[PDB]
RNA sequence: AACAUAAUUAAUUUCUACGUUUAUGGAGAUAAAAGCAUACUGAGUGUGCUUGGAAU
RNA sequence: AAAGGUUUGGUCCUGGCCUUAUAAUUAAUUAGAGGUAAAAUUACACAUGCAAACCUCCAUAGACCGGUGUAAAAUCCCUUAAACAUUUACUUAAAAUUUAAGGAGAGGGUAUCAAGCACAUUAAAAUAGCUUAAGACACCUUGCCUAGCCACACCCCCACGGGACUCAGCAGUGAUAAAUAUUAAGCAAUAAACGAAAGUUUGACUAAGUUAUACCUCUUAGGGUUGGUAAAUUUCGUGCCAGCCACCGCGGUCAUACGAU
């Protein structure tokens with residue numbers, strides 16, 4: 001019974017790890033889009049400042 | 051007014067509500083949690099509300115808590131065999147954390163009842179002795195038996211004072 | 221291979237000193253219930269542990285194993301593991317280097333370096 | 334106290350008040366006081382007849398068998414109780430004492446008959 | 460703690476007292492000397508019991524008999540007057556080693572070893588003889604050894620099994636019926652494993668205590 | 676300080692002899708504009724500060 | 732605590748003291764007997780008697796029971812190992828009882844005791860460490876853990892030795908203190924010791940004696956109080972006197988407060 005519970009524990013940890021990668025993946029897409037826009041403003045401001 | 055927030059946490063009834071009694075293998079439970087964030091809210095409530103209850107039922111287990119050392123909160127149990135059980139409690143409610151640890155490393159209800167019955171094996175209702183250990187100090191208390199001479203005087207013929215006098219007379 | 225008599229077969233603590241040769245001074249903490257207040261506080265104990273390789277640094281969390289025979293008057297434990305190295309933590313959940321509540325290496329990436 | 338030497342024994346510990354004795358059957362180290370530290374209580378003995386005319390003995394026969402199996406000696410009064418119950422054979426002196434009592438009452442009866450015969454001689458004299 | 464301090468005098472006293480005991484050990488001639496007028500041991504002042512008075516004046520000690528024999532009577536048979544009176548069957552010791560007390564001016568105190576034959580049954584190994592200082596020993600003549608040691612064993616008639624006590628028998632039969640065992644066999648105790656030696660059987664002298672050397 | 680005798684049943688003796696504590700002027704009864712800190716003298720004044728003085 | 736009395740010219744706040752409840756001891760006054768429990772000024776000194784024997788010699792026992800609270804923060808609970816001056820069985824395995832080494836946690840006071848001064852590690856014998864405001868060290872006081880446990884046994888912590896040279900066993904005595912049980916009977920019961928046993932011994936104990944210290948059952952009635960708190964004073968004497976008060980207070984001539992009634 002101990003071994004079965006220790007196997008179920010690892011499965012629960014992997015199931016949550018899969019969700020973590022899915023959530024962090026979505027953030028990378030959204031944050032990347034924002035970063036491109038922010039870099040554009042820096043380019044416009046940097047050119048104006050120069 | 052009792053000091054602090056949620057002063058009910060400092061009552062024996064609340065501490066006795068804990069249901070997680072660890073197996074004898076469990077020796078240490080380190081808690082890594084973050085004080086700031088949104089995915090670690092359940093972990094913070096677990097340290098606030100449940101860690102007192104866990105320690106109360108498991109006095110010999112070392113509970114050591116670490117703050118803001120890792121990106122995510124987790125629980126790591128150290129067993130006597132040398133095994134290390136890592137648990138991930140991110141995005142998990144404090145109630146969910148308690149139920150999870152109970153399942154993997156918590157004694158079952160059947161086991162606990164057997165120990166309670168075994169603990170009282172040497173207490174016998176028939177046994178006589180002090181009130182701390184026994185129901186009745188003396189057999190005089192039982193109904194139908196000869197009552198205590200202090201409460202009720204014994205018949206003259208049942209007294210050593212009377213019997214000694216007759217032997218002198220004989 | 222009988223085990224130690226001491227109750228603390230396994231103790232976790234922080235390395236508060238390392239000035240003795242091959243020995244690390246470790247501070248462990250346990251929770252003790254105040255009977256009047258019914259609140260738990262930290263009772264801390266100091267444990268001398270045999271650091272064979274002198275691989276310990278002040279501030280790192282370590283796991284100690286009770287020695288079967290006391291090495292000396294105070295050295296009754298050995299260094300089983302360094303749970304967290306000071307400033308060099310590796311997230312147990314993901315396995316990536318971290319520096320506080322942040323990832324030095326993103327878990328999405330697979331550097332394998 | 335910190336005893337050195339001795340053995341476990343099953344004996345009667347005296348309780349009650351003056352003229353009202355009551356016993357606790359107990360297993361105790363022989364060197365301990367009669368009513369002091371004991372190991373286990375194995376029953377009780379009330380030597381005074383109750384309203385129903387019954388002297389009441391309680392024996393924890395499971396624990397008594399356990400402690401006799403571990404070397405526990407028995408006091409002579411306890412061997413007499415175990416013999417009357419039927420758990421042990423009757424003690425040799427229980428049988429011998431009953432024989433002495435029979436021989437002592439036989440003499441008394443014979444003396445009474447002789448006295449009545451002597452009284453009969455007085456009746457003959459008138 | 461750490462305020463508990465050594466006790467040098469206590470340690471010195473224990474050791475020192477031990478040395479005196481080893482050097483000043485008394486001898487059999489002194490511990491077991493007797494005053495026959497008062498029947499009291501001078502070393503300790505111990506007065507012998509009343510039932511032993513007749514034999515102390517009427518019987519000999521073992522090494523009083525053996526001191527008169529060549530090689531201190533190695534190989535000879537010796538019996539006790541107490542056994543002769545109590546047991547019809549031959550009871551004797553076959554002597555194998557004898558260590559007299561050389562200090563004794565008549566070599567009448569010492570230790571002995573031999574092989575026991577009690578009530579016709581002979582032991583297989585030699586052990587030290589107890590009660591050597593008793594006035595109870597009788598040397599067997601060589602010409603009477605064959606007639607003295609002649610024994611024919613009778614078939615043993617002591618029961619080998621007996622009933623259980625009345626209550627303990629009922630508890631056994633009740634357990635049988637509860638467990639489904641249906642039988643009318645009578646529970647029987649087996650007495651062979653635990654048969655008692657006679658009370659006067661020779662005891663182990665090697666494990667017996669010796670009196671102290673402090674005079675009264 | 677702690678050797679040696681013995682040994683065709685086995686034993687014998689040795690197994691020592693300093694320092695540290697307690698004890699033999701002040702404050703309390705029976706009545707027979709101000710202040711704080713500080714300096715000087717004598718409360719007087721000096722310097723700074725507070726309003727728990729005052730001022731349409 | 733269900734509270735009450737008491738700072739003031741008055742009100743409110745704050746804050747101490749005291750009262751009302753419960754018990755132990757001693758004391759004043761008072762009291763019949765009976766059942767029961769308890770018995771206690773002092774680790775001051777002790778006249779006298781007793782408290783350990785048994786038993787065919789060897790051994791065993793007198794290492795217990797009983798007593799006192801000397802010492803020491805001394806302990807509790809727990810772990811490990813080994814034993815015993817033991818038992819019972821096997822000629823080897825179950826117990827009781829101890830000992831030693833330890834530690835999850837808990838454990839009196841003073842911080843005007845703030846530093847301790849070798850208190851550490853390594854094991855080629857080097858390193859410079861160890862404890863401490865999360866209370867070290869020092870000093871002071873204290874039996875606690877209560878089916879009971881610990882410590883002590885004339886003193887010198889010990890007891891080879893020395894000396895103030897033995898009742899902290901029961902009962903008694905002197906001194907001391909507010910403090911006051913019999914110089915008693917029996918081993919019939921239970922417990923212990925001894926014996927193979929019939930049995931023997933025991934100031935343990937059992938049954939009594941003593942004592943309103945407590946409870947129970949009866950039966951006589953005594954003790955105190957009477958301004959407020961706080962239940963209850965009628966006439967006289969005294970006149971800031973004599974006295975009374977736990978607190979507030981009373982008495983200097985109409986005293987519900989003192990004294991008698």
Ligand code: FES
Nearest residue numbers: 188190198350353
């Ligand atoms: S307490 Fe039971 S007879 Fe007294």
Ligand SMILES: [K+]
Nearest residue numbers: 736737746747
């Ligand atoms: K008040």
Ligand SMILES: [K+]
Nearest residue numbers: 757758759760
């Ligand atoms: K009085």
Ligand SMILES: [K+]
Nearest residue numbers: 801802883888
């Ligand atoms: K002492």
Ligand SMILES: [K+]
Nearest residue numbers: 918919920921
């Ligand atoms: K008796």
Ligand SMILES: [K+]
Nearest residue numbers: 952953954955
């Ligand atoms: K009255």
Ligand SMILES: [Mg+2]
Nearest residue numbers: 658659662789
């Ligand atoms: Mg004998």
Ligand SMILES: [Mg+2]
Nearest residue numbers: 711723724725
């Ligand atoms: Mg200013």
Ligand SMILES: [Mg+2]
Nearest residue numbers: 757758910944
């Ligand atoms: Mg009085």
Ligand SMILES: [Mg+2]
Nearest residue numbers: 334366796797
């Ligand atoms: Mg005692």
Ligand SMILES: [Mg+2]
Nearest residue numbers: 800801802873
């Ligand atoms: Mg004291």
Ligand SMILES: [Mg+2]
Nearest residue numbers: 885897898899
């Ligand atoms: Mg004295």
Ligand SMILES: [Mg+2]
Nearest residue numbers: 884886889890
């Ligand atoms: Mg002494």
Ligand SMILES: [Mg+2]
Nearest residue numbers: 898900901902
């Ligand atoms: Mg006395």
Ligand SMILES: [Mg+2]
Nearest residue numbers: 884897898900
């Ligand atoms: Mg004495």
Ligand SMILES: [Mg+2]
Nearest residue numbers: 770771910911
């Ligand atoms: Mg008194």
